[PDB]
């Protein structure tokens, strides 16, 4: 699949490492642009963006970012009052973007959050917003009565977003399509009469991966767990998986790693 996503977050007051307003854009799960609140400019975060050669591209994104920054300040004040909340560090969130699936079909998303909770969700195929609570209903009615909000978003998600996603996937292809094979280590530690085997895959790219266990060459799902995939500092990824086995049986088990860098899933032993 392919994906373009923009994430926006505002907070009533900053704190260490937390700006008042932020925007980050992702192509196929990798950051490619980010707002700089100090210079008030959208900036590249990956080198292949030099291939975006349209004039005024950065200026246009920067203008949208600055407008949205002002809107987010207004929304925080509006929603504090609508929900009869005390003053404090409240948050507000927007995510939107589009997907191109394996069969070429498309999906589009626009979701709004307030204070860490769902607020509004867009359904482009019915041109309506779903409100999470009675307070969000007030915005639903405002937007559905303006009469052009849903139509403009649906057009963006089905046309503009998809057109730019196809361009970004082509500009970024040598980075996005590279394959890094993980370094895999299987280890074991025993406690309370149980040998826990850990299989750790270090430094794989791209992000999707599947880990399973084989016992004497057979699939074994009993007593298995896995961590969420997490990033390294260089843009590759990391994951762990474990299985509980009988002490003395460690040699019977293999970690099985399904990953695009492995044409055939790799097998690893402790």
């Amino acid at each position: 699949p392919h994906s373009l996503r923009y994430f926006f977050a505002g907070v009533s007051e900053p704190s260490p490492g937390v700006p008042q307003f932020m925007i980050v854009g992702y192509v196929d799960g990798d950051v490619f642009v980010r707002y700089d609140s100090e210079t008030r400019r959208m900036e590249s975060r990956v080198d292949w963006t030099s291939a975006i050669d349209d004039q005024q591209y950065w200026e246009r994104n920067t203008q949208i970012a600055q407008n949205t920054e002002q809107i987010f300040r207004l929304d925080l004040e509006t929603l504090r009052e609508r929900y009869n909340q005390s003053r404090g560090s409240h948050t507000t969130h927007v995510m939107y973007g589009c997907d191109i699936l394996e069969d070429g079909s498309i999906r589009g998303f626009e979701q709004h959050g307030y204070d860490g909770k769902d607020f509004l969700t867009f359904d482009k195929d019915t041109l309506t917003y779903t409100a999470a609570d009675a307070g969000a209903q007030i915005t639903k009615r405002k937007w559905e009565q303006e009469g052009t909000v849903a139509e403009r978003m649906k057009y963006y998600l089905e046309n503009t977003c998809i057109e730019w996603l196809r361009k970004y996937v082509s500009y970024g292809k040598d980075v996005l399509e590279r394959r890094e094979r993980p370094e895999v280590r299987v280890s074991g530690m025993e406690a309370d009469k149980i040998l826990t085997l850990s299989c750790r895959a270090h430094g794989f790219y791209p992000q999707p991966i599947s880990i399973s266990w084989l016992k004497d060459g057979m699939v074994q799902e009993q007593e298995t767990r896995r961590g969420s995939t997490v990033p390294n500092s260089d843009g590759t990824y990391h994951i762990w998986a474990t299985i509980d086995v009988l002490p003395g049986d460690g040699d019977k088990y293999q970690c099985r790693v399904e990953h695009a860098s492995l044409p055939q899933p790799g097998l690893f032993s402790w």
């Binding site: 246009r60 407008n67 949205t68 915005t139 909000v149 978003m153 963006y156």
Partner: peptide, 9 residues
């Protein structure tokens, strides 16, 4: 590219 200016809530 980003969507040009969402409405206020």
């Amino acid at each position: 590219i980003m969507f040009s200016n969402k409405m206020a809530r």
